[PDB]
Write a protein that binds this ligand. Structure first.
Ligand SMILES: [Cl-]
Lengths: 242, 242
């Protein structure tokens, strides 16, 4: 029973941007967004695909656990954080695309396809390079679809092991304190227009959970930090966090 | 393997306090403390016993998962956060003694004893009431023994399921940001002298884990906040956290 809140567009305009924030009050089974149409527009997921990709790689044993080390391949890349060994925890934290490309190759085109259909993940289309389709292939997901997928991950309802889902939700840990916990993943789609930034995840309160998915136009990397700052202004506006 | 660092006494002195901080560098397999004698003095665990108690209740199915609700028994207590319903996450957060006392009665004397022996938890002596021996019974544990127990929990090496251990480590989440994660549990032992405060757990970094166990004299409730404050001053001093 979705509800539209145009007040929120203020946060996008003040930041010289356009985008959508979608929230879901789990207790009340009630959704809210600034833009019902853009909430259902599907885009490339970019690094937010590291959630289902990690889930699949764990459940198939391509990743043994959150401690297994995947060493640098020696090629210097532009993001310096990528030029070191990683585990699942730090691979996610620094969005190490190459580590997840290796996972995608080992998972294989056919297993990737079956699992994403099992998840009902976006348009379930992995057309393109096995190792790049979430950046420049056929897969597409909307903010509302992000929420639906996230709600199943949260409740361990996806068709992978419970252990797989616990580990990935651990790896998503972004922020925690005495008022709330945030489990989430950023994304930045640049290879295919329109270039957009994503932030999807949820906020755990003592007595409720609030899922969120936001994307926003992002022509230049200068505004990447607005992904989180706008979402948090909306969460503050709505009294979800202090 | 266990070095003394007396410069940390400055943090206790400046807070008109007395106690010990024990740190363990997991990568280097080396410990550090301001007071070797007090680091091996064993005390009642008070609410730090909620870690082993939770693990045992989970593995035995007394607790089904972190979402199962334990309803307030209607008895108003002086700590207002206890006079509501709780799950495992929030019973840990608010140290809700009565929920854990009910866990312990359902675990029972014999199961509690045998499984604490399996954990090599302190002196393994549950003498007293099954539902309060960790507040005023015979169980004693030192800071270096907290460390040993915590390290097993971290590595999933205790003799309970990986899932029980993952759940309890999730319930231990205290603080997280882009620099570190802290999983820990406070405790406050008042029923038998000497009255003391505890804080035990660890700091996850990208590339290392630092375990910590501290206890401090606590003649009045007014210095409770110094359990965390003094520990964080040592971590700052050692450049484990900024
Ligand atoms: Cl966690």
């Amino acid at each position: 029973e979705w509800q539209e809140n145009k007040s929120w567009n203020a946060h996008f305009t003040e930041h010289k941007s356009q985008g959508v924030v979608v929230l879901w009050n789990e207790n009340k089974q009630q959704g809210f967004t600034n833009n019902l149409k853009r909430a259902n527009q599907a885009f490339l997921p970019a690094s937010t695909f590291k959630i289902p990709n990690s889930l699949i790689a764990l459940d198939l044993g391509v990743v043994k656990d959150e401690h297994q080390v995947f060493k640098w391949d020696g090629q210097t890349r532009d993001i310096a954080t990528w030029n070191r060994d990683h585990n699942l925890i730090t691979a996610m934290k620094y969005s190490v695309v190459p580590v997840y490309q290796e996972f995608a190759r080992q998972i294989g085109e056919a297993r990737m396809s079956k699992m994403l259909h099992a998840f009902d993940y976006g348009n379930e289309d992995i057309s393109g390079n096995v190792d790049s389709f979430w950046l420049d292939g056929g897969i597409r997901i909307s903010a509302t679809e992000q929420i639906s997928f996230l709600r199943k991950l949260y409740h361990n309802k996806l068709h992978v092991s419970e252990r797989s889902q616990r580990i990935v939700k651990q790896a998503m840990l972004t922020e925690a304190n005495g008022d709330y916990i945030i489990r989430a993943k950023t994304g930045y789609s640049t290879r295919i227009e329109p270039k957009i930034g994503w932030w999807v995840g949820w906020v755990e309160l003592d007595d409720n959970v609030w899922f969120f998915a936001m994307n926003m136009d992002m022509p230049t990397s200068d505004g990447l930090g607005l992904r989180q700052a706008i979402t948090k202004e909306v969460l503050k506006q709505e009294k979800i966090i202090p």
